[PDB]
UniProtKB/Swiss-Prot annotation, chains A, B:
Similarity comment: Belongs to the protein arginine deiminase family.
Chemical reaction(s) catalysed: L-arginyl-[protein] + H2O = L-citrullyl-[protein] + NH4(+)
Name the record gives this protein: Protein-arginine deiminase type-2
Organism: Homo sapiens (Human)
Keyword Transcription regulation appears in the UniProt entry: no
Domain of life: Eukaryota
């Protein structure tokens, strides 16, 4: 396919390595002695030679006596299809003649050693390293796309394989060597491991990476394969697309103090697999919770919920360097996948700077507000938006309005999420909340028995409507926070809430904030009102004009398929049941969702807007392969 | 198209601005008094109202008595198609009823003011700003692609136009304002100009850009248009794609110390036009030359060449802050184009840190080797490579091998050229040359009477073949450098050159360097041997093992269509003509190329490998529009 220039040298022999998959064009005119008129040629069995004049080519026999006029426009094309062995003498010889006699006045030779050199990866994405995929030097998205995929080492049987395959005689001819190399830029993105001395053992050493840009490879004769393992060192990010290159070159020695000439180069491209987040609709595997040792109702009720499922429960306690919610706030469960292998990968952002066990990879963060917590990071189910499908869903991050001067998640984390590309992040407005997390106002739940889902939204208007109804019904004196002794002296009733004029105005405003988010979610997730259910919520404004929960936010719930762990609201008691619990059941249960209310606050005797427990669910990855997506340019 | 949430408020009136191109979904259930059972509605002439229950919608008359059951799943959809005027009373009123009587127990209203707000650009790329192109919020490549294009101000009638078009009543309702804005990131990429006080004059002020991220716009009633002019501040580069965004928002006042809510936002995208280089095949306009005042033969011969064409000649002399070749080395002629306008743009990189006149834009550079000179920057004619078309050609930059430790053009300039994208740069190997410029070894020329072109390559093998022929013919004592008195004592003859064994070896090596480039050029430009002509050249090796010209390099030539200004080689005289001149004529003239040899060295009495003049040709731009290309992702 690729034409390489090799000229005969005046009255001499040229020796050259021929790399299979290329061919040579050979100038015979320049090596012709002055006064020479015509030329003839001989060649060996395994070398194919054409005489090319003005673009027109004719094959030549091994020993012909045929002669052609010498012209700069008459050249040779030289091709080989099989590697040289010790039995080979591969050559082309050209005889030169003057006008007078038929005995050659001079001759120029070309002696060839043919070798196969191919740097191979699994570009067709089946988990096997195929021989010389013609597409291995590029990377394309989609079901028809090709090029190899690399996993970040988040901690070598599970790394990517790269195989240098060669075929040839006992040794390379004098003056050649084979070198593997990478660019300085890619040197902090990858590393490559190799057994340098296979005669002395199995020991794999790092041959390419930080501080090592090239490695000279030992040539072995016959048909040989050299196995390399490759790891990614980092995820795609603001200035890094995820694509890296590795090269092998056959180098020719020229002279001392002159660099070696790269006479053949083969290239493979890898893309580093992105970090992917799992939405609530995916099958649960493990439920992780953190709380204080004595919150007994919480642990018992979570255990009972989990016992309704096939999931395993993992209990963590509170640590000195972490928040009360850390399993929710400082940890996010995600995954990476390559054709051959995949594993769960946790983003870890410790408050002050344990874990899950060996089955997980970990990405730990190297100015920060509450909006940096992973409570502020959510992901939608797969959605179609104006005809465009997002098969992995879309990441949702809470923010403030552009002109507001409000809080925002750090650019570093936003840039990281954006750079993964396959979840196409969307910013929502969370900064009207004191804590500032999207998970305080919204969640997703599957609809049992279907492939569909609902968006759940906190609604203050729903709460006021319900409370007004109960008051009309004669329940105005129904008290909230039953069983929280630290709330009792406040004597909070439906009447007291409904009569508070400033609280009404605060909550109308918070409903405007919720509705602004509702509109962004409908637009960017392609949802209609039929896809949404509102759950009652109520907030109190702080000094910053931001919202804190008046009673526990029910929307932030543990979703295990049909079973929902819902924070216990401690609402007004009507006929000895919480009217908030009954209302929420009436909304959800007709859909086949099973509700379990989980009391995370009783142990503290009161509720001031802060939650002291956290939960996080590890889920099975999407069955859709991320490399089958086609993201926008 | 876009659904916006507007809820009725319990027993009250809500007033809202309606922006045309959206519609409202309206909750009536939350505003219902406790105990209310059914509702009815009235609406004005220009407001369309549907009652929506469980996804099913039915239009409602202006005054109906129809009643519907109150349910959270029964809502209103509210649409307007025309802007409000002073004659409008646009409203929807909802009456609430209990089980008992038919007289309403309460009512909630919605009072609307409809306005049109559209931020408009020329997205369809015809030079006119069309009304609200649905595609203005994106940017796509190709003949079917859309989105607006911005020119860099390289120095406002020629800037891009952006028009804010509004329609509505005499004033915005209380609590609203319209604001134009950009991101902090884009603030150094753009600037926007506006007449802030049209009553006091025509004065245009900078309203958005560095240090100004937002501008409050004055609303005028009726049908109004506000004209803005937009400029790009910089070209695409390593961390900047070329894409920028400008937004207009309608903001709602909530309260003191609470940020304004962006209730409607419209966005336009601009792409900043790339800098594009012109190949030798494009029509010449002006020829620029620099030399010392007394190089008379040079000026006379260049003038005579130019007089064979319709081109204009511009003569520059030597300056203290610049090189002897500066018009070639420190200046590169290129262009930018937008649908409405285009102009030539010069890259200027002064050696130590005049010009062309007002018709040109200038980009001046803010560690450096010879490879940074623009002699080391070339561009191919349009080419097709493995089925992929490069309609603007491909930029060529000289470099050294990856593992060599050799010189390279600075990353800053390489990154810039790559970031323009439309010329898809290719690196060649120039570092075997002392000066290190691709223009020392290669050039392109059209084939007269056709749409085709040739690559010209320097060849040492061609020179040795020619000299060997002349020696065989009895011309061995023919002397070179005739008329250069400072060379005479050297007595350089064909015999003396051919007998120098080390010089032969040096030049065989230089031919290997040339051939390595030949192979890259054939591969990356999709050329065959039929596309190439070799011209004789000869070099001498320096202490760094790099090549300097033995006699002037003929390949670096002035190409004006069929007419070629070729450096005079001062070769061996045979029958009182230079055998190099005669040889080159014999190669080129049969193709209809007319050769004029230009003596740039006689004034210096000798030639040591350095050229003391420079030339550069300004050309007409490609007729193919760059935005019609589709570059690789
Ligand atoms: Ca494979
Ligand atoms: Ca989260
Ligand atoms: Ca237009
Ligand atoms: Ca140039």
């Amino acid at each position: 396919l690729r034409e390489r220039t090799v000229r005969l040298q005046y009255g001499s022999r040229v020796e050259a390595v021929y790399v299979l998959g290329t061919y040579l064009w050979t100038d015979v005119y320049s090596a012709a002695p002055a006064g020479a008129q015509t030329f003839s040629l001989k060649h060996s069995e395994h070398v194919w030679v054409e005489v090319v004049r003005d673009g027109e080519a004719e094959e030549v026999a091994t020993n012909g006596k045929q002669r052609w006029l010498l012209s700069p426009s008459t050249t040779l094309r030289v091709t080989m299809s099989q590697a040289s062995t010790e039995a080979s003498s591969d050559k082309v010889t050209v005889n030169y003649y003057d006008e007078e006699g038929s005995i050659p006045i001079d001759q120029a030779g070309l002696f060839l050693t043919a070798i196969e050199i191919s740097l191979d990866v699994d570009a067709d994405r089946d988990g096997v390293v195929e021989k010389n995929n013609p597409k291995k030097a590029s990377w394309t998205w989609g079901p028809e796309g090709q090029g190899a995929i690399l996993l970040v080492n988040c901690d070598l049987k599970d790394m990517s394989q790269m195989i240098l395959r060669t075929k040839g005689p006992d040794r390379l001819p004098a003056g050649y060597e084979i070198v593997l190399y990478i660019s300085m830029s890619d040197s902090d993105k990858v590393g490559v491991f190799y057994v340098e001395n296979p005669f002395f053992g199995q020991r794999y050493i790092h041959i390419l990476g930080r501080r090592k840009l090239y490695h000279v490879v030992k040539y072995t004769g016959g048909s040989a394969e050299l196995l390399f393992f490759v790891e990614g060192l980092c995820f795609p990010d603001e200035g890094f697309s995820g694509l890296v290159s590795i090269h092998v070159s056959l180098l020719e020695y020229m002279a001392q103090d002159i660099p070696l000439t790269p006479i053949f180069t083969d290239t493979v491209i890898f893309r580093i697999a992105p970090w992917i987040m799992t939405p609530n609709i995916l099958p649960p595997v493990s439920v992780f919770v953190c709380c204080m040792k004595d919150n007994y109702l919480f642990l018992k009720e979570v255990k009972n919920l989990v016992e309704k499922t096939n999931c395993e429960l993992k209990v963590c306690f509170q640590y000195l360097n972490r928040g009360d919610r850390w399993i929710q706030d400082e940890i996010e469960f995600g995954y990476i996948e390559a054709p051959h292998k995949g594993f769960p990968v946790v983003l870890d952002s410790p408050r002050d700077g344990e874990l899950l066990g060996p089955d997980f990879g970990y990405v730990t963060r190297e100015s920060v507000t509450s909006l940096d917590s992973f409570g502020n990071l959510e992901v939608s189910p797969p959605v179609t938006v104006n005809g465009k499908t997002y098969p992995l869903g879309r990441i949702l991050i809470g923010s403030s309005f552009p002109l507001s001067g409000g809080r925002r998640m750090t650019k570093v984390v936003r840039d990281f999420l954006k750079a993964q590309q396959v979840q196409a992040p969307v910013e929502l407005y969370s900064d009207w909340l004191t804590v500032g997390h999207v998970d305080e106002f919204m969640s997703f739940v599957p609809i049992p028995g279907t492939k569909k889902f609902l968006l759940l939204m906190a609604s203050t208007s729903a709460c006021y409507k319900l409370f007004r109804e109960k008051q009309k019904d004669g329940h105005g004196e129904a008290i909230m926070f039953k069983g929280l002794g630290g709330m009792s002296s406040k004597r909070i009733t439906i009447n007291k809430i409904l009569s508070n004029e400033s609280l009404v105005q605060e909550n109308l405003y918070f409903q405007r904030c919720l509705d602004w988010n509702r509109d962004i979610l409908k637009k960017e997730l392609g949802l209609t009102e039929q896809d949404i259910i509102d759950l009652p919520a109520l907030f109190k404004m702080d000094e910053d004009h931001r919202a804190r929960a008046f009673f526990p936010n029910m929307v932030n719930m543990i979703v295990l398929d049909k079973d929902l762990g819902i924070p216990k609201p401690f609402g007004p008691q009507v006929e000895e049941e919480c009217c908030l619990e009954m209302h929420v059941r009436g909304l959800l249960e007709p859909l086949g969702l099973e509700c379990t209310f989980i009391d995370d606050i009783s142990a503290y005797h009161k509720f001031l807007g802060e939650v002291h427990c956290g939960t996080n669910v590890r889920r099975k990855p999407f069955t859709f392969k991320w490399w089958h997506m086609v993201p926008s340019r």
